Paper text:
NUDIX hydrolases are conserved throughout eukaryotes, bacteria, archaea, and viruses. Their name derives from a common substrate structure, nucleoside diphosphate linked to another moiety X.1 The characteristic NUDIX box is shared between family members and contains a sequence motif “GX5EX5 [UA] XREX2EEXGU”, where U is usually valine, leucine, or isoleucine and X is any amino acid. In particular, the nature of their physiological substrates remains an object for debate, e.g., NUDT5 not only predominantly hydrolyzes ADP-ribose (ADPr) to AMP and ribose-5′-phosphate but also exhibits activity against 8-oxo-dGDP, 8-oxo-GDP, 8-oxo-dADP, 2-oxo-dADP, and 5-CHO-dUDP. A recent systematic exploration of the NUDIX family confirmed that both NUDT5 and NUDT14 are able to hydrolyze ADPr and ADP-glucose, yet the function and cellular roles of NUDT14 remain elusive. Here, by screening a small kinase inhibitor library, we identify ibrutinib as a dual inhibitor of NUDT5 and NUDT14 catalytic activities.
To explore the potential of 9 as a dual inhibitor for NUDT5 and NUDT14, we next performed SPR with a purified human NUDT14 protein and confirmed potent direct binding (KD ≈ 400 nM). Since compound 9 is the first inhibitor of human NUDT14 to the best of our knowledge, we attempted cocrystallization to gain insights into the binding mode. Extensive crystallization trials yielded the first inhibitor-bound structure of NUDT14 in complex with 9 at a 1.82 Å resolution. Notably, this structure also revealed the hitherto unresolved conformation of the N-terminal domain in NUDT14, which consists of β-sheets intertwined with the NUDIX domain of the second subunit. Similar to NUDT5, compound 9 occupies the active site of NUDT14 where the heterocyclic core is involved in π–π stacking interactions with W34 of chain A and Y17 of chain B. In addition, the aminopyrimidine moiety is stabilized by hydrogen bonds with D35 and the aromatic ring of the phenoxy substituent interacts with L107 via hydrophobic interaction. By contrast, superimposition of the NUDT5 and NUDT14 cocrystal structures in complex with 9 revealed some notable differences: although the main π stacking residues of NUDT14 (Y17 and W34) appear to be conserved in NUDT5 (Y36 and W46), 9 is sandwiched between W46 and W28 in the NUDT5 active site. The hydrogen bond to D35 for NUDT14 is retained with E47 in the NUDT5 structure. In contrast to NUDT5 where the phenoxy group of the inhibitor engages with the hydrophobic side chain of R51, the NUDT14 structure revealed an interaction with L107. Compared to DMSO control, 9 led to a strong increase in NUDT14 thermal stability (ΔTm = 5.5 ± 0.3).
Numbering used by the authors:
A (entry chain A): 0 to 82, 86 to 172, 178 to 219
B (entry chain B): 1 to 168, 178 to 220
Amino acid sequence: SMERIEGASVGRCAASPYLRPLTLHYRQNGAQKSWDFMKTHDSVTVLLFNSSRRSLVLVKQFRPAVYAGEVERRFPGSLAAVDPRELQPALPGSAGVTVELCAGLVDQPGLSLEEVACKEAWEECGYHLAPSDLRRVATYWSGVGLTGSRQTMFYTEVTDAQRSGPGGGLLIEVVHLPLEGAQAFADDPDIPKTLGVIFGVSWFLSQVAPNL
Amino acid sequence: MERIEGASVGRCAASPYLRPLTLHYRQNGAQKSWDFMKTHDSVTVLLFNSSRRSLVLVKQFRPAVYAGEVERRFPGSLAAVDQDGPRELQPALPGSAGVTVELCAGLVDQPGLSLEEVACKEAWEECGYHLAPSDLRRVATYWSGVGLTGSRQTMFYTEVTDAQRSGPLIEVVHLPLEGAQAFADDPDIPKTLGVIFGVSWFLSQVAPNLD
Ligand SMILES: CN1CCC(n2nc(-c3ccc(Oc4ccccc4)cc3)c3c(N)ncnc32)CC1
Ligand SMILES: CN1CCC(n2nc(-c3ccc(Oc4ccccc4)cc3)c3c(N)ncnc32)CC1
Ligand SMILES: [Mg+2]
């Protein structure tokens, strides 16, 4: 359903609420330089372990920027000199479907990072969390080359008693990855995923799974 | 490397590194659009100098990290720039606010080169270590951006000795194995997820088989 993508076309983007390209001009040890980047929000990510199912909770969705990069890789020149053309040839929508950690932007003032992660775990994963349930795994710079944003990773264990039914949050597929093949899943090069997934899986297996 | 002066922020229109695009597509039969930046793929490489029992990392000023740190502390610093040229950030932050610790890394922007060759070029240019492409082992491939970019990053690993190190801006960091995990766990040390993962991966997957 969410992997069904047709009529894909690419065009130049002028104004956008989501793209804030900027250039920093600066003198570094006397020499004048410039650097191109984008203003973006900080973010949080949360890894959930469902102990009732012995499974890590991830999310699957279509990422248009991933899709377009995959189309370019397979058909070079697809995204060339665009500055509204139909992608011919194109790829199935599954080429842009990623596996990710539950994640969201820090763009609501008055909310702690924990509260942001709880809202995203509800809205994306259908899991009811309390902010005090969350343990900070790591904080780091994401996208140091083009974005200056901090990202904070949380972890929490959940049970099926915290899982919402089908429907509920008024398109994302919730993924439950069994611990059996979790490492093999992260190591699988044919599955488009993020470093947060790869790190989250190996961190959980080496830091949490032994103590269960 | 850390002496950063006259910092000012202006609009970015062209840029070889960020190209604004919109994907138009029908998903649930419904017409949608998505704005993103076309960017380069990248490679990173984690080096383990077995002569020194140290991981090799790089320290450098990252202007985007700096600007984000100046937006924090001086909110509105990165507001929309008008037509009177760049807006001076006076006062700003010391350059150290933008200094990161990272894996050796670089852009995939030279046609004809394999990913391994890009990694070797960077390990020489940034770390002063001579590598052959056959020395590199693929650790992980992943999407480093998914939301506003769709860039792929490939992480390599190799063991080196001092025999591959050249003799006597970027700082080469040699992180002893003894304190590596505590270094990676330290939130006061501005580092990337690549460093956190690379340290954790090395200590769990490579280190136990040494000695
Ligand atoms: C000599 N040398 C050449 C490249 C010049 N250069 N590099 C970048 C840039 C862009 C993206 C990028 O992404 C990565 C790559 C690897 C790992 C993580 C992120 C890194 C650097 C750039 C920029 N954004 N704006 C202006 N000039 C920029 C600087 C001067
Ligand atoms: C209903 N809903 C509203 C937002 C709409 N929307 N979201 C994005 C967008 C931008 C950045 C972004 O960053 C993240 C966030 C979390 C984790 C990783 C990366 C995520 C989404 C967007 C876009 N770039 N262009 C056009 N429309 C876009 C879609 C439809
Ligand atoms: Mg460099």
